[PDB]
Amino acid sequence: TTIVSVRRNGHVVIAGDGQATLGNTVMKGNVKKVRRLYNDKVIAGFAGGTADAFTLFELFERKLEMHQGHLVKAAVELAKDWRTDRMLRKLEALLAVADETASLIITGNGDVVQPENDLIAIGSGGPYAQAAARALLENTELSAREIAEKALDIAGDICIYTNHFHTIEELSYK
Amino acid sequence: TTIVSVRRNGHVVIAGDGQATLGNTVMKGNVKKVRRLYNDKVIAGFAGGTADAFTLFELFERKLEMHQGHLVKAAVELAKDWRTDRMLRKLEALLAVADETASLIITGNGDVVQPENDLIAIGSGGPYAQAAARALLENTELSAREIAEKALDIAGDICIYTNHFHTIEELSYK
Ligand SMILES: [Mg+2]
Ligand SMILES: [Mg+2]
């Protein structure tokens, strides 16, 4: 698994691989790990059970409505319920989300994190994509979509658990 | 991870590294491991899950309000709940805290400890910073902020799990 997010020049994106491993065997290659939320104003991705993320994403929209779409406050309420509830505590996933305001991470420990320069990379391949995106962002003018695309192909070549099927959700705020 | 506390000449401080390791890989370098509490009257640090410490720090403020800000009595009530509750028993972290009165440590076993000369050092690098702070305190006139800063840079050079990003919260009571 690998997922990436990048923000540049008024554009922010999220991208993720389609591989679903089972043991040493590939279960499914076309999984959609990236999607839009809250009237498409938000883009997000997940590493974990497809239902485990679908549940957390729905409650996150309810946290946004209570906070009128604020990204940070809705996330802390989601991470707060995640470690707290005995039902949600069984859930095991890594959530990534960004909007025009900022990108940040969420975890089943209840930790929330905004990466330096809003650069998110998660999944088993995420350290590899982070090293690739870090290089292009400093040494090239490429748009945030161009960097997240190339960084994910590299993590898929390296991580055995990541493949080259891609899904992306870009957001332009300029 | 490394965290340090020092008290001298009416000044007490807490300092900690930003490294967040995952396996053999660095996850985040800028983590804020030190913060203030109870109307900024108290400074504290933590080694463990960022949510696991944020939960314990909140309840400790509630223990302070019940005890009117007493540091020692509020800590024993926190360490008492920590080992006791089945929910808190799952939490795994090392807490450090000090005010103008004294510095002391807290643990998930429920142990509370005041170091000799209120010198706290914890984390994977904490034994290294303790040996450095012990030398400067006896052989130099340096202020408590100067010793905690230099002791943490040494532990970061030594401990692979500690880095040189720093956060400090000083308290002056003179
Ligand atoms: Mg592969
Ligand atoms: Mg180091």
CATH label of the domain that carries residue B76: 3.60.20.10
Tell how many helices (H) and how many strands (E) occur in chain A: 5, 11
- B156 marked as binding residue: yes
Residues of chain A in contact with residue B49, where contact means CB-CB under 8 angstroms, are 109-111
User: How many Å apart are CA B148 and CA B135, to the nearest integer?
Assistant: 12
Q: How many domains does chain A have?
A: 1
Cβ contact (<8 Å) for B49 and A109? yes
Contact B143, B8 (CB under 8 A): yes
Residues of chain A in contact with residue B50, where contact means CB-CB under 8 angstroms, are 109, 111, 113
A2-34 exposure pattern, b = at least 16 Cβ within 10 A, e = fewer = bbbbbbbeebbbbbbbbbbeeeeeeeeeebebb
User: How many Å apart are CA B94 and CA B96, to the nearest integer?
Assistant: 7
B55 touches chain A (CB under 8 A): yes
User: How many Å apart are CA B24 and CA B132, to the nearest integer?
Assistant: 26
B72 touches chain A (CB under 8 A): no
Residue B158 zone, left/alpha/beta (φ > 0; ψ -120 to 50; rest): alpha
Q: Is A1 considered catalytic here? A: yes
Model resolution, angstroms:
3.3
B49 touches chain A (CB under 8 A): yes
Contacts of B83 (CB under 8 A, 6+ apart): B89, B108, B109, B110
- B159 marked as binding residue: yes
Q: Determine the residue type at A77.
A: E
User: How many Å apart are CA A56 and CA A46, to the nearest integer?
Assistant: 10
CA of B127 to the centre of ligand 2 (A): 15
Pull the structure tokens for residue B59. 């309840």
Longest CA–CA span in chain A (Å) reads: 46
Residue B54 zone, left/alpha/beta (φ > 0; ψ -120 to 50; rest): alpha
Pull the structure tokens for residue B150. 């230099």
**Residue B165 CA, distance from chain mean position:** 15
User: How many Å apart are CA B79 and CA B104, to the nearest integer?
Assistant: 12
Ligand showing the shortest atom-to-Cα distance for residue B156: 2
Query: Which alpha helices (H) appear in A11-69, and where do they start and end?
Result: 50-66
CA of A21 to the centre of ligand 2 (A): 34
Q: CA A48, A50, A55, A61 torsion: positive or negative?
A: positive
Q: Tokens 């590493």 — which residue?
A: A47
Contact B18, B32 (CB under 8 A): yes
Task: Give the minimum alpha-carbon distance from A134 to chain B in angstroms, rounded to a whole number.
Answer: 14
Residues of chain A in contact with residue B52, where contact means CB-CB under 8 angstroms, are 109-110
Residue B117 zone, left/alpha/beta (φ > 0; ψ -120 to 50; rest): left
Q: What range does the domain containing A15 cover?
A: 1-174
SS3 category, B39: coil
B160 touches chain A (CB under 8 A): no
User: How many Å apart are CA A98 and CA A79, to the nearest integer?
Assistant: 15
User: How many Å apart are CA B35 and CA B40, to the nearest integer?
Assistant: 9
